Design a protein around this ligand. Structure first.
Ligand SMILES: Cc1ccccc1-c1cc2ccc(C(=N)N)cc2[nH]1
Ligand SMILES: [Ca+2]
Length: 223
């Protein structure tokens, strides 16, 4: 997260860190047994880490659970990142508490202008590199589809939306991938892609979760 702020320990209880010997992507807990992340975060040997703040220090409220199954969306296209969503089932159900909680799925799509909360452990520098230990946060509005498509001509599909600031300075980044974009208490987006980080007229691109609620619900119920 670039231009963001330190969230505060466990203030985003649904935020998860995917670890394969190191943090490589974020995710969102949608119920005690399932996590939603980005398809481009797919990899073998994933351990889900819940209740995390400083990912390099065991602070006492964490739960480390191995993934038993990963399901990448059937239509995911790695070339274009269209349908960049994946489900991860935990080997054992997480113990839900104030620091480890699920985030509800949307019942409808959010409109442009709606303010959302984006979080993650990605790089915090627009130019250069610096990875934080604690969770970073960023409040950003959903941008109009016209402004989104104008920034990325011929790259935006109906399964994507942009959020952030066209002036630059605030944006998600490398390491935040797969993480949550919550608006009005619902998981509306997944950190997917963008051009560089916090660059002018190059807002972040997010997977439009509302288009996948039926798939998520049906897939979880059958697995
Ligand atoms: C597009 C891409 C190809 C290969 C590896 C990483 C990425 C990538 C992920 C990613 C996440 C977020 C952003 C952003 N500036 N909001 C940009 C990004 N860019
Ligand atoms: Ca920790």
């Amino acid at each position: 997260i670039v231009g963001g702020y330190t969230c505060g320990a466990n203030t985003v209880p649904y935020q998860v860190s995917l670890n394969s010997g190191y943090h490589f992507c974020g995710g969102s807990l949608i119920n005690s047994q399932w996590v939603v992340s980005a398809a481009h975060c797919y990899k073998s040997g994933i351990q889900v880490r819940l209740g995390e703040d400083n990912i390099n220090v065991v602070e006492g409220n964490e739960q480390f659970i191995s993934a038993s199954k990963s399901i990448v969306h059937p239509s995911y296209n790695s070339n274009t990142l269209n349908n960049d969503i994946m489900l991860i089932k935990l080997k054992s159900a997480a113990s839900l508490n104030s620091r480890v909680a699920s985030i509800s799925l949307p019942t409808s799509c959010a409109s442009a202008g709606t303010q959302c909360l984006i979080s993650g452990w990605g790089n915090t520098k627009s130019s250069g590199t610096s990875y934080p230990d604690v969770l970073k946060c960023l409040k950003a509005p959903i941008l109009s589809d016209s402004s989104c498509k104008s920034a990325y001509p011929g790259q935006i599909t109906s399964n994507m939306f942009c959020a952030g600031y066209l002036e630059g300075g605030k944006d998600s980044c490398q390491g935040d991938s797969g993480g949550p974009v919550v608006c009005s208490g619902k998981l509306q987006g997944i950190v997917s892609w963008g051009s560089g980080c916090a660059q002018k007229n190059k807002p972040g691109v997010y997977t439009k979760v509302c288009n996948y609620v039926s798939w998520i619900k049906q897939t979880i119920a059958s697995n």
